[PDB]
Design an enzyme around this catalytic site. Structure first.
Site, PDB file in Angstrom:
ATOM      1  N   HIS B 100      38.671   8.886 -15.353  1.00  0.00           N
ATOM      2  CA  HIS B 100      37.724   8.385 -14.319  1.00  0.00           C
ATOM      3  C   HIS B 100      36.037   9.563 -15.110  1.00  0.00           C
ATOM      4  O   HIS B 100      35.936   9.505 -13.282  1.00  0.00           O
ATOM      5  CB  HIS B 100      37.821   8.582 -12.834  1.00  0.00           C
ATOM      6  CG  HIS B 100      39.393   7.379 -12.413  1.00  0.00           C
ATOM      7  ND1 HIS B 100      38.974   6.444 -11.625  1.00  0.00           N
ATOM      8  CD2 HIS B 100      40.084   8.340 -12.699  1.00  0.00           C
ATOM      9  CE1 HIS B 100      40.190   5.724 -11.857  1.00  0.00           C
ATOM     10  NE2 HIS B 100      41.181   6.729 -12.042  1.00  0.00           N
ATOM     11  N   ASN B 173      41.872   2.809  -6.114  1.00  0.00           N
ATOM     12  CA  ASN B 173      41.409   2.160  -7.299  1.00  0.00           C
ATOM     13  C   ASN B 173      41.024   0.389  -6.630  1.00  0.00           C
ATOM     14  O   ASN B 173      40.958  -0.120  -5.310  1.00  0.00           O
ATOM     15  CB  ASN B 173      42.818   1.768  -8.265  1.00  0.00           C
ATOM     16  CG  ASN B 173      43.150   3.208  -9.480  1.00  0.00           C
ATOM     17  OD1 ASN B 173      41.941   3.726  -9.091  1.00  0.00           O
ATOM     18  ND2 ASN B 173      44.104   3.045  -9.366  1.00  0.00           N
TER      19      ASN B 173
END
Ligand code: HEM
Ligand code: HEM
Lengths: 723, 722
Positions: B100, B173
């Site tokens: 990420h 997510n």
């Protein structure tokens, strides 16, 4: 069932199938390409064939699929040291990226001098033509982070590490002959200006935003290297097809104490070739690894990157004879006035085994230099000497980064330095000099036995913060550059400026840049001003332009496409085919391409094999969808009634021809393949279109058209086509 | 003189004496305030009228030159101003996040609708009057800091709640499941999907050998592979995707009652996605598309808005499903357990400095508050140790909570001391229990809010073993497949076929489609054909999973079934050149504005164009610099001279071909059809709106747009060359 459960139980069995090619570590694909540095790195390579999976302490792991829990449905226990060590190593994999040139690509090779340069330098690796000096090169962009795309418009860095017997020499250059700024104190300002802006971190890999151009407009010294990056030099086709420059004037000291000012050049054996903007952009989208991949596959193919090291040599007495200061890094030395002498050859012939260990962890500094080379008083170079080692202490974890394998010299390097983080050497002797308890070993080396000395250059002046008046000259060379460009290259320069300023929101910044262009060339300014809707005042159209430079108004060496030095060998060709294609036409094309060292790849609607109208299987290289025209140099469509019909219902196969046409590329159409072009809204075949019925003859004519690189005549009609 | 001036100290002014640029949040939305932002004001720097100084406070007179031994001499080591400026620059970079790395941040607030005391003692979920501040970072997964936004990836969604009883981090997510079941496999999965370690290729893509090799050998990954292969993998905006914490958590109430919980975020702006060809082109002409979209939407007032939803399960119903609720490769179908919308979150202020706020923010799933607890989900259990561990290297040590964006807004006294960059200066006893300070700060009893772990029974043997109940790899992939509209199924086949196209080793592709035959025979056959694989008779008879608690489909797992398309805040291109019809633009704009839609005039050049009525009208940017892939739909007003120039322009004719192929709505007023008719484009279908009156053509245009994409056009779009 049992098969399902087996995937989440320890894997004690073979997994590979029972027994064209993927990219592999260099040790696997070119083990026969060796050098002294690579042999030193072998001590650190791992052969895990037949080895147990272990912890870093050497404990065999029995179950790599499950944490230790309190019941097979329970809570994970803190005593699972295997889980924590594996996760902990994962958690700490990342180190800081380079503050600039974060996006890079590495390869190993070797360098040889053509003959002794002892008339100019004592530097060991330039004395003996039989030595092969190992090198490691890292090519890079400048602006973007790790993960930014390769084919951005940008300067390309070019850093060569020479592992000589008398020290590691780092030649840390770019692919243009000048830099943006004159004094190192401006570097964080310039860099902050081109980097993504601090509030939103936008944009990536791009100078086309407000703060970069704000800085340009206020610092005319930048205009010269802006012209270079706004030209097609700003988007090369390959790291094998660009020039390299050390930019700064160095010194070379010979065994008689004499000094010669020198400038370093790399001339590519494969020529100088660039993308066009619209194609460079689409490539960033569909293959951000295009240059990294091209370099890698180049070495696996044996199309080794090959460059000649060139020197510009100026006697000490000649320093002040030019219209410019030769210590000014925004000034080039035109090759018309001071020719480049090709003194040796570099070949890159082996990819790394591990990108991170080798390419990421490599450390280059301008300050690492060797006896026989010395610094000049360039105020940008002088500032570089301090930055490279400073940044690497935090990037690579402390002062012992020279102990990391890729960075170690291949010669001895004893001294009295001790400790620091991750100290690998183990030293027992006295750690101070002078000592008598070790009879003062290791010992200083007399200059006559190779000890480094600085050339005793005279120094006279006052302690001062001031820009040299000999540096105040911002438009001469931008104008020389402009006038040396062909008409097409000038048009693309105008396109670079017009596209980039088009993305600048604040209008006064675009007008301020366009105003700077009126001091370089009025037509250049007029063309850019028109694309931006700016009206130039009568005054601006009369602004004074610089005159010739030491008699020169032009220098062809600054043009990419005037020299006619385009190389055909190692280019990439798309062969569009589907089932029912003429197998012998493909076979004859591949013979003609291989004849000239050109690489044809069969792209089809699906991977695997297609079947030729003669019923033979033909291996596919990829699909048309996953391999757009922007990834190749030219396109040849062979015959086969059923192949052409299939390709005509595929919008990608038809867009392939429209796109290749709009990007000024050569297209060959055999037999009934001309239907595809005809279906498209494409005009009459020009010089860049080759139609023909016999394959080997079509391909020969097709290769000859490729020799021109792009079909520049087509540019005007190509703009009109919807594609 | 003008030239000499630029290389001398700059004591004079330099300022001159859509429409406006993106700016720091403190400059554009200063009236959007919360408690965390007011705390951050303490660290903001206002430089108007200030001197340029060194970090020790010394005024700098010449920022243009190094100290030299003469104006052409050698730089002096005693130039401390040069070295301090260069040294700071040399150490600007810190490690990127291991996953990420590529992310976008904004500030906002959250309100609970009504008290949730029935379920949890968590302070921020008790009182609907409170505006508890939040900071959100959206992200991709695979790519490094400078990779593109609109790659095909999972999107991370991390919300930090600055509550009065502790900072709570909801780290999830945009798909309801993850790839793997046990945290011990995370480095393996991540290594497989990341660039390969010899060449570091490819960036921001799972479309390579090692990823699909791993999938093919770990069937547990297949469910979330389906999600990434669908259009979920390429959302249009962070405002139009869903969010999930994925793990089953626990909520404990004042009575000590435990409820299992799964977190949801539902977009008020609906759930919309790009298509693959349009996503890939967008990464070429704007790698910052999502980051820019989020920033501009906040400056425009189309604040991202999400409703926090909870799936609630009594502790006794833990085993009522055909899957383990502790299995992070399993979703809980919204039919079986509805999602209760419990509060709203609004994002309404951009950061001032990306690095200070977005890059340095630290989120850990272990940052819970009293009232929430962990389940024995063995993936969540590993995450608790990883977040804090990695932040010590990424952020410089154990005092990263003292970094402004990471500080709580409540007190936080303890006996911890020292560490790198220690900000607080603590005068008191540093051990507990002590008498010399009468044991302050003191432990808090549970009835006063001290954290306690819910006393869950624990039984079994110390073992490394995957629970029998986790061994169900194919059922939820099938549920997801059968729940997709026809066009969404085709797009899933597209993702699989394109991705496996880039895989070099044939046996990996074969092993992957073989895994697909255990999900759906026709999905496997479609993908097998696109890859030249012939399925055996045995493969075609491979057993398929039955329903899940009587469920075979679930409409909620579909994007384009339940008409989750919002029109407010969409973007429309308006293709105009010099000679356009003034009155048309006005009526287009007034219609679009009526619907919350932003229209942008794109012309050949920038600045202004003059209409046939002789008036000047501001352009938003060039046609060339803003391709159709950046807008939701195209409209072309009339004006004979406008149309004529557009027809000579390759970009503007391609604008409509590409808009067409990407299934978007195209409006053409008057002779604008002149331009459509010139291209190789079929007869106007349901997403081609012609008309001579602008307000009517706009009103009908805005109503084609409500369907997001003309899915019908898909089959004829393939054959169009463009
Ligand atoms: C003549 C103009 C310059 C050129 C051609 C140049 C070239 C380069 C190149 C090619 C790299 C990448 C090396 C690699 O692959 O690792 C680089 C990195 C770097 N340069 Fe420059 N540079 C120039 C000016 C400057 C200046 C003025 C400074 C600041 C004083 C500077 C500081 C740095 C730093 C800190 C790095 C990163 C080094 C690392 O992390 O290993 N450079 N430069
Ligand atoms: C349920 C599946 C998972 C989800 C939804 C998830 C979600 C995320 C998200 C959204 C981020 C980015 C946070 C940010 O913006 O800063 C992240 C980062 C991270 N995750 Fe995960 N993750 C999961 C599984 C794992 C696992 C199994 C591990 C390893 C044990 C792990 C370790 C990490 C680490 C080390 C980071 C970087 C944290 C930082 O540098 O600040 N995650 N995760």
């Amino acid at each position: 069932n049992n098969k399902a459960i087996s995937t989440v139980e320890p894997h004690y069995e073979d997994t590979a199938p029972a027994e064209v090619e993927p990219m592999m570590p260099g040790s696997d694909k070119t083990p026969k390409n060796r050098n002294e540095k690579l042999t030193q790195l072998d001590k650190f390579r791992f052969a895990p064939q037949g080895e147990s999976l272990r912890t870093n302490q050497g404990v065999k792991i029995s179950d790599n699929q499950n944490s230790l829990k309190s019941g097979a449905r329970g809570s994970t226990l803190l005593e699972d040291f295997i889980l924590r060590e594996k996760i902990t190593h994962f958690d700490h994999e990342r180190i800081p990226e380079r503050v600039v040139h974060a996006r890079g690509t590495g390869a190993h090779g070797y360098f040889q001098v053509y003959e002794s340069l002892a008339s100019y330098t004592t530097a060991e690796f330039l004395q003996d033509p039989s030595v092969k000096t190992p090198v490691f090169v890292r090519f890079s962009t400048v602006q973007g982070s790790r993960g930014s795309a390769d084919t951005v418009r940008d300067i390309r860095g070019w850093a060569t590490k020479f592992y000589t017997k008398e020290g590691t020499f780092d030649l840390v250059g770019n692919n243009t002959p000048v830099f943006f700024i004159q004094d190192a104190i401006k570097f964080p300002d310039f860099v902050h200006a081109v980097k993504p802006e601090p509030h939103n971190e936008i944009p990536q890999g791009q100078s086309a935003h407000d703060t970069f151009w704000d800085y340009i407009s206020l610092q005319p010294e930048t205009l010269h290297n802006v012209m270079w990056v706004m030209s097609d030099r700003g988007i090369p086709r390959s790291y094998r097809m660009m020039e390299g420059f050390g930019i700064h004037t160095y010194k070379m000291i010979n065994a008689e104490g004499q000094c010669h000012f020198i400038r370093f050049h790399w001339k590519p054996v494969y020529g100088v070739s660039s993308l066009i903007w619209d194609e460079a952009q689409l490539l960033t989208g569909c293959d951000p690894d295009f240059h990294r991949r091209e370099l890698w596959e180049s070495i696996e193919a044996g199309d080794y990157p090959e460059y000649e090291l060139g020197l510009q040599i100026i006697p000490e007495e000649d320093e002040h004879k030019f219209d410019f200061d030769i210590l000014d890094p925004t000034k080039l030395i035109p090759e018309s006035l001071v020719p480049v002498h090709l003194v040796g050859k570099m070949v890159l012939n082996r990819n790394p085994d591990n990108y991170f260990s080798e390419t990421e962890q490599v450390a280059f500094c301008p300050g690492n230099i060797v006896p026989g080379i010395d610094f000049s008083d360039d105020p940008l170079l002088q500032g570089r000497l301090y930055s490279y080692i400073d940044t690497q202490i935090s990037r690579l974890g402390g002062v012992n980064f020279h102990e990391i394998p890729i960075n170690k010299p291949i010669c001895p390097f004893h001294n009295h330095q001790r400790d620091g983080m991750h100290r690998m050497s183990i030293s027992g002797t006295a750690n101070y000099e002078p000592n008598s308890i070790n009879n003062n070993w290791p010992r200083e080396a007399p200059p006559t036995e190779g000890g480094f000395t600085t050339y005793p250059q005279p120094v006279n002046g006052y302690k001062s913060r001031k820009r040299s008046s000999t540096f105040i000259d911002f438009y001469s060379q931008p104008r020389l550059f402009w006038l040396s460009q062909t008409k097409v290259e000038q048009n693309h320069i105008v396109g670079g400026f017009s596209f980039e300023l088009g993305k600048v929101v604040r209008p006064w910044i675009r007008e301020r840049v366009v105003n700077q262009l009126t001091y370089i060339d009025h037509q250049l300014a007029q063309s850019v001003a028109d694309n931006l809707g700016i009206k130039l005042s009568q005054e601006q159209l009369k602004h004074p332009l610089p005159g010739p430079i030491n008699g020169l108004s032009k220098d062809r060496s600054l043009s990419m496409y005037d020299g006619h030095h385009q190389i055909l060998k190692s280019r990439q060709v798309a062969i569009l085919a589907a089932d029912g294609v003429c197998g012998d036409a493909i076979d004859n094309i591949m013979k003609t391409l291989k004849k000239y060292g050109v690489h044809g790849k069969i792209f089809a609607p699906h991977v695997g094999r297609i079947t030729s109208l003669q019923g033979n299987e033909i291996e596919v290289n990829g699909t048309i969808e996953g391999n757009p025209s922007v990834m190749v140099d030219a396109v040849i469509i062979p015959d086969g009634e059923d192949s052409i019909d299939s390709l005509m219902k595929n919008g990608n196969a038809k867009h392939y021809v429209i796109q290749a046409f709009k990007h000024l590329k050569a297209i060959g159409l055999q037999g009934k393949a001309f239907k595809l072009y005809d279906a498209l809204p494409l005009p009459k075949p020009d010089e860049g279109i080759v139609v023909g019925d016999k394959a080997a003859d079509l391909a020969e004519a097709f290769c000859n058209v490729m020799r021109g690189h792009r079909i520049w005549s087509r540019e005007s009609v190509a703009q009109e086509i919807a594609g």
